[PDB]
Amino acid sequence: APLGSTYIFSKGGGQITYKWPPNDRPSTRADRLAIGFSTVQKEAVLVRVDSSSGLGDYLELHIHQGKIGVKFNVGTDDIAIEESNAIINDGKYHVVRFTRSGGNATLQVDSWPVIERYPAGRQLTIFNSQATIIIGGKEQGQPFQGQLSGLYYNGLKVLNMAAENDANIAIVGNVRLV
Numbered sequence: 001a002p003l004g005s006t007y008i009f010s011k012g013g014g015q016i017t018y019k020w021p022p023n024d025r026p027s028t029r030a031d032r033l034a035i036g037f038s039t040v041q042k043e044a045v046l047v048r049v050d051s052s053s054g055l056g057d058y059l060e061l062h063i064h065q066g067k068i069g070v071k072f073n074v075g076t077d078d079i080a081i082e083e084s085n086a087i088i089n090d091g092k093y094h095v096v097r098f099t100r101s102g103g104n105a106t107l108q109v110d111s112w113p114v115i116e117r118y119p120a121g122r123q124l125t126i127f128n129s130q131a132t133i134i135i136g137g138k139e140q141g142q143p144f145q146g147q148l149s150g151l152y153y154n155g156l157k158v159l160n161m162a163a164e165n166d167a168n169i170a171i172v173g174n175v176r177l178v
């Protein structure tokens with residue numbers, strides 16, 4: 001189960017935001033995103049990384065009809081991958097792992113088979129000018145309720161950073177440490 005900081009998200013919702021310095025936003029050709037979670041929800045946004053580049057690039061981990069999935073867009077089309085079978089909303093700890101290299105991507109939950117997505121046609125490869133990581137909710141999305149831990153995004157252990165009141169972190173709403 002979890003290592004390090006855990007946040008509980010209670011009814012009504014809350015959101016932790018990591019905001020990169022505006023003159024030092026990363027653009028990446030490959031990404032790794034993982035998070036640990038426990039919940040009984042059927043619909044929730046867990047994590048979303050948004051860009052400031054006006055190109056619309058994004059990466060989102062969410063639960064839909066009780067199943068964990070990823071949707072992302074690095075410039076071409078919206079790519080959606082769902083782990084359609086793993087039970088993830090039994091209130092027990094689960095880990096979801098996402099990777100991307102260019103336009104290709106994988107998703108895996110727990111010890112279930114890795115899902116490998118190789119989209120057809122022209123694909124862009126850079127996740128441009130990443131501006132914010134939002135955790136536990138988003139504008140136009142349904143807020144997470146449960147516990148989140150072990151958020152790793154391209155090397156950043158975001159929830160541990162939140163736990164020490166990193167200066168790039170903001171926390172709002174109904175969410176608290178452990």
Ligand SMILES: [Ca+2]
Binds near residue numbers: 057074
């Ligand atoms: Ca792009």
